[PDB]
Amino acid sequence: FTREQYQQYIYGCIRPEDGHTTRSKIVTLPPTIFKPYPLWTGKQIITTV
Amino acid sequence: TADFRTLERESRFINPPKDKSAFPLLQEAVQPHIGSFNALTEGPDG
Amino acid sequence: LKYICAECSSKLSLSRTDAVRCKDCGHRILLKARTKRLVQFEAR
Amino acid sequence: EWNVEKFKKDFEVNISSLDAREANFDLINIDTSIANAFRRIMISEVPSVAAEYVYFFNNTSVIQDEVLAHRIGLVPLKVDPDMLTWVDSNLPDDEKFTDENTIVLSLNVKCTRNPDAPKGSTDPKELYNNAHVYARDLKFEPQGRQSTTFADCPVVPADPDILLAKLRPGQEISLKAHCILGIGGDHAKFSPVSTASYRLLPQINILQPIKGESARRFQKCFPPGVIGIDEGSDEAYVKDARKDTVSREVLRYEEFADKVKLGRVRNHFIFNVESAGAMTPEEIFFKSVRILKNKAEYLKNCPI
Amino acid sequence: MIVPVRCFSCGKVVGDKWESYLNLLQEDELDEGTALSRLGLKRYCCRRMILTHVDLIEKFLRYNPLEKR
Amino acid sequence: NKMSPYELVQHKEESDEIGGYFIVNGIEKLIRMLIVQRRNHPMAIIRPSFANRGASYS
Amino acid sequence: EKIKLLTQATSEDGTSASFQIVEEDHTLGNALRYVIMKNPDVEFCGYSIPHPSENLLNIRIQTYGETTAVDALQKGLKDLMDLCDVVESKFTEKIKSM
Amino acid sequence: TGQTPIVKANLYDDYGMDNFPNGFNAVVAVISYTGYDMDDAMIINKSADERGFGYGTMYKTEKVDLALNRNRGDPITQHFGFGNDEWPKEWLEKLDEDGLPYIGTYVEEGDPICAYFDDTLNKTKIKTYHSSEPAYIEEVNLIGDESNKFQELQTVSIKYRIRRTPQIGDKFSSRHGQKGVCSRKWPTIDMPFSETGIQPDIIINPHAFPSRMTIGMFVESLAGKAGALHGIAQDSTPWIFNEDDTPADYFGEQLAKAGYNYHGNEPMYSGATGEELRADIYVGVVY
Ligand SMILES: [Zn+2]
Ligand SMILES: [Zn+2]
Numbered sequence: 001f002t003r004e005q006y007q008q009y010i011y012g013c014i015r016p017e018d019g020h021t022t023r024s025k026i027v028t029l030p031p032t033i034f035k036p037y038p039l040w041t042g043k044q045i046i047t048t049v
Numbered sequence: 050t051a052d053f054r055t056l057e058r059e060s061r062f063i064n065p066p067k068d069k070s071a072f073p074l075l076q077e078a079v080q081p082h083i084g085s086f087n088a089l090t091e092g093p094d095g
Numbered sequence: 096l097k098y099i100c101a102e103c104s105s106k107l108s109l110s111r112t113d114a115v116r117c118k119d120c121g122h123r124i125l126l127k128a129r130t131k132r133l134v135q136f137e138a139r
Numbered sequence: 140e141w142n143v144e145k146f147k148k149d150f151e152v153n154i155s156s157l158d159a160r161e162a163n164f165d166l167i168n169i170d171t172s173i174a175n176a177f178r179r180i181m182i183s184e185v186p187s188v189a190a191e192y193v194y195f196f197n198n199t200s201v202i203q204d205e206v207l208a209h210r211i212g213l214v215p216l217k218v219d220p221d222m223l224t225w226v227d228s229n230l231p232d233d234e235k236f237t238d239e240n241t242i243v244l245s246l247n248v249k250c251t252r253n254p255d256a257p258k259g260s261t262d263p264k265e266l267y268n269n270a271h272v273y274a275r276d277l278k279f280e281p282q283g284r285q286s287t288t289f290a291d292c293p294v295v296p297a298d299p300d301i302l303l304a305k306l307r308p309g310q311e312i313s314l315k316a317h318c319i320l321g322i323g324g325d326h327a328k329f330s331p332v333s334t335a336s337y338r339l340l341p342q343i344n345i346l347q348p349i350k351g352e353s354a355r356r357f358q359k360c361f362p363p364g365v366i367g368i369d370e371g372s373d374e375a376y377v378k379d380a381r382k383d384t385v386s387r388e389v390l391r392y393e394e395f396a397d398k399v400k401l402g403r404v405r406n407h408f409i410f411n412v413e414s415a416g417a418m419t420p421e422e423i424f425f426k427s428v429r430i431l432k433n434k435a436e437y438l439k440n441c442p443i
Numbered sequence: 444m445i446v447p448v449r450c451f452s453c454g455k456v457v458g459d460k461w462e463s464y465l466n467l468l469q470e471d472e473l474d475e476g477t478a479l480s481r482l483g484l485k486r487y488c489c490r491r492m493i494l495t496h497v498d499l500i501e502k503f504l505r506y507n508p509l510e511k512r
Numbered sequence: 513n514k515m516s517p518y519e520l521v522q523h524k525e526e527s528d529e530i531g532g533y534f535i536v537n538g539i540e541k542l543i544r545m546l547i548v549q550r551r552n553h554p555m556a557i558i559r560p561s562f563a564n565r566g567a568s569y570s
Numbered sequence: 571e572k573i574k575l576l577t578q579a580t581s582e583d584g585t586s587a588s589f590q591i592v593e594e595d596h597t598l599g600n601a602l603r604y605v606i607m608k609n610p611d612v613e614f615c616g617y618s619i620p621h622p623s624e625n626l627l628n629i630r631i632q633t634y635g636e637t638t639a640v641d642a643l644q645k646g647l648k649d650l651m652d653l654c655d656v657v658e659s660k661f662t663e664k665i666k667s668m
Numbered sequence: 669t670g671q672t673p674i675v676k677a678n679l680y681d682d683y684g685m686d687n688f689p690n691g692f693n694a695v696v697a698v699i700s701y702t703g704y705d706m707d708d709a710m711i712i713n714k715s716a717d718e719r720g721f722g723y724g725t726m727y728k729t730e731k732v733d734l735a736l737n738r739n740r741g742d743p744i745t746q747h748f749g750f751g752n753d754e755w756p757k758e759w760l761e762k763l764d765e766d767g768l769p770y771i772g773t774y775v776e777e778g779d780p781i782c783a784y785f786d787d788t789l790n791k792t793k794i795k796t797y798h799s800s801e802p803a804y805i806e807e808v809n810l811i812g813d814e815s816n817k818f819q820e821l822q823t824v825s826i827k828y829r830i831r832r833t834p835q836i837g838d839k840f841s842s843r844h845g846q847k848g849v850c851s852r853k854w855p856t857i858d859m860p861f862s863e864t865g866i867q868p869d870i871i872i873n874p875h876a877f878p879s880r881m882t883i884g885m886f887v888e889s890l891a892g893k894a895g896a897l898h899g900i901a902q903d904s905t906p907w908i909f910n911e912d913d914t915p916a917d918y919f920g921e922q923l924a925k926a927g928y929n930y931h932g933n934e935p936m937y938s939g940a941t942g943e944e945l946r947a948d949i950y951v952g953v954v955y
Pocket of ligand 2: 450453454455488489
């Protein structure tokens with residue numbers, strides 16, 4: 001997942017204003033692959049979920 | 050393949066047959082009901 | 096004329112204590128005809 | 140880095156065809172997020188005029204009233220949606236339908252038996268009088284100041300042969316219909332578009348050369364304008380990557396499971412906008428990029 | 444019962460094409476595949492409206508309570 | 513009884529209308545069919561309730 | 571009452587803040603999310619619908635600093651405006667040539 | 669508006685079932701897209717039945733009998749029509765001068781359906797609509813009594829019609845036992861869409877197939893789509909296919925001659941995000 005896709009799947013399920021988060025700010029992870037362009041593996045979706 | 054019987058389905062909707070009915074196989078589905086009441090009045094020995 | 100014979104489709108009226116039958120054939124079922132009135136619909 | 144001048148260099152439009160109803164055109168180097176945002180407006184949020192309130196005075200026909208009212212609502216009306224404004228729903232019915240908000244349509248048709256029909260006829264157009272009610276029988280009645288601004292163009296339906304009802308003698312239909320604006324998110328009758336959707340440009344990538352007698356069977360597994368054979372050497376190439384329906388027929392044959400792959404150009408959209416009749420498909424897409432600009436402009440000025 | 448205006452999938456106006464279709468099957472002796480293509484019905488959602496319309500209103504209309512018989 | 517499907521329409525019934533049913537108080541009733549033992553054939557039957565006709569019944 | 575800053579999700583610094591837009595579908599929320607993820611100061615951004623049967627739309631914007639989350643939203647609405655002003659011009663330049 | 673099926677047995681046209689249409693051909697995609705259709709549920713395109721997809725009505729008839737409280741020639745105390753008392757002018761709207769309702773009037777709960785004058789109380793009582801679902805009055809019969817002496821009317825049959833637009837929670841089904849209620853009339857711009865431009869007006873889950881093993885619905889999808897393209901109907905009376913001529917091969921080679929996929933699939937896109945989906949989505953029309 002690219003960075004626009006990665007941050008869309010997290011806010012589509014957390015939504016901090018309904019109090020599903022515990023930090024009042026969505027924290028993320030560094031991507032799995034830095035070069036040539038950043039990508040997040042789908043393991044790492046549920047890691048930050 | 051089958052066929053859509055358009056221009057025959059449509060013509061039979063406009064004017065029904067003045068002779069005997071189309072689809073005679075539907076009339077044989079109730080002959081054990083129709084022909085059973087017809088035996089009460091007609092047939093052999095009255 | 097507010098009624099229709101169900102048999103012969105002749106339109107007719109029906110006064111007080113009058114017999115329910117068509118004046119043209121002895122049929123006992125009258126159909127109340129539809130008089131022109133506003134009926135408001137939403138086209139949905 | 141992204142900029143509005145970097146997008147202005149890479150974006151271009153490649154228009155294929157025009158017609159009074161259908162327009163085929165392309166958007167290059169634009170996102171799927173924006174190209175979907177244009178077709179979601181063309182179906183749902185671009186206005187059109189359709190019949191919403193139908194006022195039956197008499198209906199003794201076989202098709203009942205809410206269904207016959209529903210069919211008048213689905214009739215497309217050839218009228219410019221810019222010629223009249225929006226209604227306010229909270230206003231009462233005396234003050235809501237003004238002549239700047241509402242076009243009135245009437246349908247008065249009576250059926251009677253034709254005594255001059257030939258013997259043994261079957262055709263109901265000759266055996267009866269006014270037996271079929273069409274969309275052209277919806278007569279336009281201008282009220283107020285719209286007898287002048289619609290004198291140049293009356294409200295005729297876009298498809299005048301739409302069969303509304305069928306009648307037998309003795310039966311009649313008498314109604315009035317107030318048609319107003321609305322969007323396709325409200326009801327399907329306000330979408331001014333038959334269909335508006337994109338397919339992305341397919342990318343037929345021949346990996347290994349298909350020279351020989353396998354270039355008549357590789358050509359057969361596509362639409363005929365897609366693959367051609369080269370003249371200077373017998374060699375299948377891509378003539379036009381637009382004409383292919385993505386059928387993946389080459390993947391059924393194990394001969395071509397190494398020599399070709401079927402990708403997709405991820406930013407070359409092919410819009411196919413088909414108008415229902417009220418507007419040109421040039422104008423619907425032109426409104427839909429104006430609706431999205433005004434939609435972001437409304438949030439830019441509203442206080443947070 | 445009667446021909447549907449504006450087919451159920453895309454929204455193409457279809458209801459003006461019933462009486463032309465029966466003209467293009469009886470007078471012009473065509474099969475159903477060519478007649479749906481000549482009327483401009485290309486998408487198969489549009490094609491299954493005129494191909495599979497029953498037109499059952501003609502069977503309803505022979506019960507007219509407003510005329511003698 | 514012998515009406516054409518034209519004549520069944522003119523007598524308001526239905527064109528290909530099959531009968532079979534009684535009309536009772538405006539309601540279309542139907543007497544069902546029952547499956548039942550064949551006529552005129554004596555079939556050998558083992559039932560434990562034949563023993564309960566008294567003593568020594570098999 | 572069209573745009574509304576959700577006070578229980580905003581930050582005191584102003585860098586992180588949620589927004590709630592009434593009667594907006596995926597049409598604007600996906601287009602606005604793409605344009606402001608092109609900003610090299612936005613850290614997090616995404617849109618979400620709380621329930622499809624209610625015409626509501628939430629949008630998160632979190633940024634690295636040196637800009638508030640409202641000032642990011644105002645830039646992304648300006649640049650989604652200008653992106654619709656160049657797809658309007660080139661479609662007009664090709665329909666005049668035709 | 670019923671339709672005749674694309675995919676039908678040869679016994680269908682032999683029993684005259686075209687006289688009685690019981691459903692409609694629907695563009696059915698077998699896709700997990702929605703999230704609202706898992707166990708047995710299913711969705712409709714919203715703009716499908718804004719156009720009249722699957723619309724139906726319900727007719728309900730009650731008999732208003734004014735002569736069931738007396739016996740043997742005693743004078744009738746209850747007459748249809750209005751009297752001379754001060755009865756409220758509110759119910760001239762629903763009722764005619766003879767105490768009968770008009771044809772086509774919209775009647776919700778509490779509205780009068782007939783007015784009758786009484787003699788033992790000297791007051792016009794109305795009978796009212798004892799149902800919480802609103803209706804329209806379609807026809808009013810006058811059931812006259814048959815006797816040697818002629819009698820004023822005491823029995824009137826009134827028929828209602830009720831608009832049953834397909835709401836969500838209504839059960840639809842296929843011709844293979846795939847029942848299920850409707851979840852949400854999903855909007856057209858949010859539905860998936862093919863490259864041809866169409867959108868499926870029914871979504872069924874692919875998880876309704878493996879435990880149920882209704883492979884006859886997968887092959888009605890091929891046979892339905894390959895028939896609407898060529899304008900033909902295919903017979904589907906059973907055991908016309910062997911194990912050597914599979915109908916996946918019969919209706920597959922018809923879809924290849926039209927330019928569509930052999931396996932019944934189509935490239936589809938999402939309505940929400942607008943992206944190319946992974947695999948070609950399995951579509952086609954079933955009844
Ligand atoms: Zn009479
Ligand atoms: Zn269509």
